[PDB]
């Protein structure tokens, strides 16, 4: 229940995330836009910062989400270590120019950087993310605001992200008042309707992983793909909903939002300026195996985050593995890196010798994690790229057994027994086969926006704000079709929010 103890913990967990977001957005402008840090160097510095901040205030407390920096195709999972930088090169050495940013660590111009992170205190957690964008510099200008706005489909994506974010914020604010809503009381039906029509206006589809949901203590949705739950009220937009919208558990009907509750928003929009046609938007995993295929568009990598399934137990033969398991289970149920578990990781002072100390510890931790993973104690949080499939291949396909195809050597089970589209009787395995079975291997760029809110009378928005996620000014088109019900409602909502009360937590200096 929303006690003072609960909500001030939420606040002090949130604004740490806010100031760390400011730190990263600081550093990236320092590095690229200003007169050069790589992705994995940003990540552990951000986590060091967050823990150094956490120490001052406050027993279970730490990083829910390790800071993830997706670039231009990846829906989620990219957050590598310093161990893996040469490995990424000598794996992707023969591939082509795409994914050069994520491979090398140096970011390019026009590169759509989706940052995300989160922090938790006693199970009360706050996630946040922001799609920012790189654009080259002005040199003749004195102040050098960097030159050019964005124009294309990525601009579409950013616009849809921000607009969907503000609209759902306002909707969940009107959840307090059964009034101050255009009748054009609140339901996942309405939420999915307004966000889908925004996506359709901007020609940017919703990604399967996106959601809006309730939160409770220790139960946020940090994983959302591995661990299960019976009591989960919230909305998702996956391939089943895509096919249903083309036609015409997570129940959406018996769901009306109430006072005194904490919610997570997480929206992912994949742009369509090419593609030519109607088609599906699904996800494909990234493995470390160069040898499964010959094509150059594929990315080869190793995920850094893990999560451990405390239900299972197995004595290890290996001292290093058992010590690392001690270090793990003394942490919590949230995902983690190997760098988080170490002796010198927060970097009270920072030099090269401490990074070297961390690297040696990492060399031991990978050996421990080998045995901890060969037994099914810990699993990887997968790296997922958005990939497009036209309906032509799917409808012309041949699936000799539908609703019965497992994938049988997928290790997690829950991404195995999925059945994304029950109609047409195709499963994830045959969908992967069809996605690969075509020279229309079109991968989409994606934009991401994540916030945490709580309903008391005001909407207390524990993340976001204008300091945080002010958008990179851009130049998009398809800017919001008027002459419909829902668009009138959305504009009335945006005007009426200026009076509804939205409190917003500021970052820490």
């Amino acid at each position: 229940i929303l006690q003072e103890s609960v909500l001030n913990k939420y606040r002090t967990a949130g604004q740490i995330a806010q100031t760390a977001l400011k730190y990263v957005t600081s550093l990236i402008n320092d590095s690229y836009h200003s007169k050069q840090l790589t992705v994995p160097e940003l990540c552990l510095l951000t986590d060091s910062f967050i823990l150094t901040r956490l120490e001052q205030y406050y027993n279970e407390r730490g990083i829910a989400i390790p800071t993830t920096i997706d670039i231009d195709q990846i829906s989620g999972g990219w957050c590598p270590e310093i161990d893996d930088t040469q490995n990424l090169l000598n794996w992707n050495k023969g591939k082509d120019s795409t994914f050069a940013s994520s491979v090398t660590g140096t970011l390019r111009p026009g590169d759509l950087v989706k940052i995300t992170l989160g922090v938790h205190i006693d199970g009360y957690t706050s996630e946040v993310s922001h799609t920012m964008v790189i654009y080259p510099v002005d040199e003749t200008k004195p102040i050098l605001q960097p030159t050019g706005p964005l124009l294309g489909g990525k601009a579409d994506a950013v616009a849809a992200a921000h607009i969907a974010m503000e609209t759902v914020v306002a909707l969940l604010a009107c959840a307090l008042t059964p009034e101050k809503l255009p009748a054009s009381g609140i339901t996942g039906q309405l939420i999915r309707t307004i966000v889908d029509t925004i996506a359709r206006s901007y020609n940017c589809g919703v990604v399967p992983g996106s959601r809006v949901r309730r939160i409770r203590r220790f139960l946020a949705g940090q994983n959302e793909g591995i661990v299960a739950e019976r009591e989960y009220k919230g909305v998702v937009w996956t391939e089943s909903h895509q096919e249903a919208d083309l036609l015409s558990a997570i129940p959406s009907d018996d769901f009306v939002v109430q006072s005194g509750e904490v919610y997570l928003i997480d929206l992912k929009m994949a742009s369509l300026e090419h593609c030519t046609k109607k088609g599906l938007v699904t996800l494909e995993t990234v493995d470390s195996y160069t040898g499964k295929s010959h094509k150059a568009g594929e990315l080869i990598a190793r995920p850094g985050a893990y999560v451990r399934d405390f239900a299972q137990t197995h004595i290890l033969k290996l001292k290093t593995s058992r010590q690392l398991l001690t270090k793990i289970d003394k942490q919590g149920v949230y995902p983690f890196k190997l760098s988080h578990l170490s002796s010198n990781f927060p970097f009270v002072h920072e030099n090269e010798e401490e990074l070297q100390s961390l690297k040696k510890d990492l060399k031991s931790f990978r050996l421990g994690m080998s045995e901890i993973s060969n037994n099914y104690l810990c699993v990887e949080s997968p790296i997922q790229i958005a990939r497009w499939v036209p309906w032509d291949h799917i409808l012309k396909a041949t699936n000799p057994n539908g609703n019965l195809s497992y994938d049988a050597t997928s290790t997690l089970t829950l991404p195995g027994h999925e059945l994304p589209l029950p109609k047409l009787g195709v499963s994830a395995i045959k969908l992967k086969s069809l996605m690969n079975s075509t020279k229309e291997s079109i991968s989409l760029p994606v934009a991401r926006e994540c916030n945490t809110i709580v309903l008391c009378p005001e909407l207390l928005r524990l993340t976001g704000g204008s300091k945080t996620c002010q958008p990179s000014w851009i130049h998009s088109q398809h800017e919001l079709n008027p002459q419909d019900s829902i668009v009138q409602g959305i504009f009335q909502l945006a005007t009426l929010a200026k009076d509804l009360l939205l409190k917003e937590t500021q970052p820490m200096k």
Binding site: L246, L247, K277, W391, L395, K423, L424
Partner: peptide, 16 residues
């Protein structure tokens, strides 16, 4: 023959 009908309707929607 439900797959027949749903594929017919889906062809109808994607062709236009």
């Amino acid at each position: 023959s439900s797959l027949t009908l749903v594929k017919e309707a889906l062809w109808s929607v994607i062709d236009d």
